[PDB]
Structures are given as structure tokens and as C-alpha cells.
Design an enzyme around this catalytic site. Structure first.
Site, PDB file in Angstrom:
ATOM      1  N   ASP A 105       0.831  -1.198   0.000  1.00  0.00           N
ATOM      2  CA  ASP A 105       0.000   0.000   0.000  1.00  0.00           C
ATOM      3  C   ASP A 105       0.864   1.244   0.000  1.00  0.00           C
ATOM      4  OD1 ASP A 105      -1.899   1.940   0.254  1.00  0.00           O
ATOM      5  OD2 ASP A 105      -2.479   1.473   2.335  1.00  0.00           O
ATOM      6  N   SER A 163      -0.294  15.372 -12.133  1.00  0.00           N
ATOM      7  CA  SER A 163      -0.537  14.984 -13.500  1.00  0.00           C
ATOM      8  C   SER A 163      -0.739  16.225 -14.354  1.00  0.00           C
ATOM      9  CB  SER A 163      -1.761  14.061 -13.597  1.00  0.00           C
ATOM     10  OG  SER A 163      -2.089  13.819 -14.951  1.00  0.00           O
TER      11      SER A 163
END
Length: 330
Positions: free
Chosen positions: A35, A199
Site C-alpha cells: 500500500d 498529472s
């Protein structure tokens, strides 16, 4: 040193991935959920409330000759999905794919919430976010990666998640045969303890690329792709019959639909998520309404590049002094 371990989807939907981890002496092998959005290595154990164990493999520290109770230490964690667990702490030897850390904090669950109990395939979590998020008290503990870093050939690990198929986590090296073209690296903020990056934009299907900054976290422990409502609306508008359903808890679409791809930007590069990756199947058994793999992050407070996004890429988690993230097509 290096390590290399296969990671396997827990079900036909890729709801999560499990990776075998050796704990203790002799080894006790548990299948953990790696994770990159949390920083605790915790396991079902001989200490876990019996009614809360349902099929998981447990760590039994009393059977490990290298286990030592970390005196006074406790842990307690709550995840973005509302699940939680808590317990005490041992240090023990932990190996992943041939890579060994001695004195790793192994957080032994005394209590787990129902969603963990109900998932027999996940024996615990292995956190790979920054150690600043580790919940151990009163002395915060380091992640497996943090402990291994100095011994690694290169201070990196890579996530290569498969679509409906096994993949690989590597530690300490970049497998140049595992991706196509080049790896594009992008800046990371560690300010919130996550692999947080920006992004450069997105496209829906064969549509034009929208240049726009999307701050989010690379999170292997989250199934879906959570993005701003504007982006998500633009995606599902291209699927006939798709709608946001509050009763289901997100965007649903007709199971008969063909889903468009979704592209996200990494600097000047582009990662293409095939439409099939975005189908998470019937909302309930037998239903013709299917759950979407791109969902709104509104009310999460952060955008999440979860498995839906990450599995379309070869992802480098560069833990150098100044961490960065790398993405390649594959």
C-alpha cells in the site's frame, strides 16, 4: 541487495493485490496488501480477536525465534475507505522477494474492522508511503522500504500491477525489460506523507488532451481512480446510459457498454488506461448495472491514482534524497 516478488489480484475484478511476505524465523508467509498510500506493516495474528479472523493466515510471534515485543508500542489506523485496525508491535525479520530486513516493526492486530475480517485473502498491509505517516506510538516506526533503502542497489521500488493478471513489485532495481519506451519522472511532494505528484492532464478515449494540473497520490492500496468531478463527468458523458448514483455510491454504467480509454499526463508523456480497466462489474450479483472504475474525488479531499491508473503503467517509486515518481507505458 534487491528483492522481487509477484503480486496477484485477490479476485476477478482486481479489487486489490496480494504479495507474499516472509515474517519471522522460521518464516511465516503472509499475503499482504502493498500500500503506497499508508505506512504501517500490520498483520492478522495470534492476538487478533478470534471472531474477527475468518480465513486469514495469522502471524504467531511466539513461534518466531527472532520476534521481540516492542515494549509499550501500540498502533491504530483508519483508511480512506472507512476500515480500521489496531494492536501492538513486534520487531522481526521480514523478507520480500529475497530482500530481508531485520528489526522490522510488525504491527500485530488485536482488532480489525469488518471489511478486513470479510476479506479472507488479505492477511495484512505493507505500507510503502513515507514513514512520517506510520501510526506506531509512542515511537514512530519505519516502513519496510525505509529500513531496506540503504542496503538496496538503488533506493527505489517499482510497481508493475497486472490487469486481471499477476504483476511484480521490485525493490532496489529497475527492470528495463518490464516497460516500453522511457520512464518519465515527475516531482513528488512528501508534505502529506504520500507519493504526491501532479498529472499534467487527461484525455477521454480518442479525444483531445486537456492540459490541466491534477494533484494526486500514487496509491497501490486504492482500487479505483479518483479524480475531480469535472474530469470524471467528462469521462462518463462518453458512455451511453452512465450516471452518478448516490444510492450505489458513484458512477454506474450499463454492463453492455464498451468503455472508452482514459489517458493521463505524466509531464509530456501519456499513460493510456484501456476502457476494460475501468469496468468493475455488476453492482450486485446478476445486475446489468456495472460499477465504474473512475470515480469522483469530491469529498475525499485528494485525488487518488489508484490501481486502475497504476496498472496501466510501470511505476517507479524513487526514494532518493529528493523522491520522485516515474511512469512508463508497458
Amino acid at each position: 541487495s534487491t528483492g522481487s516478488a509477484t503480486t496477484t489480484p485477490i479476485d476477478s475484478l482486481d479489487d486489490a493485490y496480494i504479495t507474499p511476505v516472509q515474517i519471522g524465523t522460521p518464516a511465516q508467509t503472509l499475503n499482504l496488501d502493498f500500500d503506497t498510500g499508508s505506512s504501517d506493516l500490520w498483520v492478522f495474528s495470534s492476538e487478533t480477536t478470534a471472531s474477527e479472523v475468518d480465513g486469514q493466515t495469522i502471524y504467531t510471534p511466539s513461534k518466531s525465534t527472532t520476534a521481540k515485543l516492542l515494549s509499550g508500542a501500540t498502533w491504530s489506523i483508519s483508511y480512506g475507505d472507512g476500515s480500521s485496525s489496531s494492536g501492538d508491535v513486534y520487531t522481526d525479520t521480514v523478507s520480500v522477494g529475497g530482500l530481508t530486513v531485520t528489526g522490522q516493526a510488525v504491527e500485530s492486530a488485536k482488532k480489525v474492522s469488518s471489511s478486513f475480517t470479510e476479506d479472507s485473502t488479505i492477511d495484512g498491509l505493507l505500507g510503502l508511503a513515507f514513514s512520517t505517516l506510520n501510526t506506531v506510538s509512542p515511537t514512530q516506526q519505519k516502513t519496510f522500504f525505509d529500513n531496506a533503502k540503504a542496503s538496496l542497489d538503488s533506493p527505489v521500488f517499482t510497481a508493475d500491477l497486472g490487469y486481471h493478471a499477476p504483476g511484480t513489485y521490485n525493490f532496489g532495481f529497475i527492470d528495463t525489460t518490464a516497460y516500453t519506451g522511457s520512464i518519465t519522472y515527475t516531482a513528488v511532494s512528501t508534505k502529506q506523507g504520500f507519493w504526491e505528484w501532479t498529472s499534467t492532464g487527461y484525455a477521454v478515449g480518442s479525444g483531445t488532451f486537456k492540459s490541466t494540473s491534477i494533484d494526486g497520490i500514487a496509491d497501490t492500496g486504492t482500487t479505483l481512480l479518483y479524480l475531480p468531478a469535472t474530469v470524471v463527468s467528462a469521462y462518463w458523458a462518453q458512455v451511453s446510459g452512465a450516471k452518478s448514483s448516490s444510492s450505489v455510491g458513484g458512477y454506474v454504467f450499463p454492463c453492455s457498454a464498451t468503455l472508452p480509454s482514459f489517458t493521463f499526463g505524466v509531464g509530456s508523456a501519456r499513460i493510456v488506461i484501456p476502457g476494460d480497466y475501468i469496468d468493475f462489474g455488476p453492482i450486485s450479483t446478476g445486475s446489468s448495472s456495472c460499477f465504474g472504475g473512475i470515480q469522483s474525488s469530491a469529498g475525499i479531499g485528494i485525488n487518488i491514482f489508484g490501481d486502475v491508473a497504476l496498472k496501466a503503467a510501470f511505476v517507479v517509486f524513487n526514494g532518493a534524497t529528493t523522491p520522485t515518481l516515474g511512469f512508463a507505458s508497458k
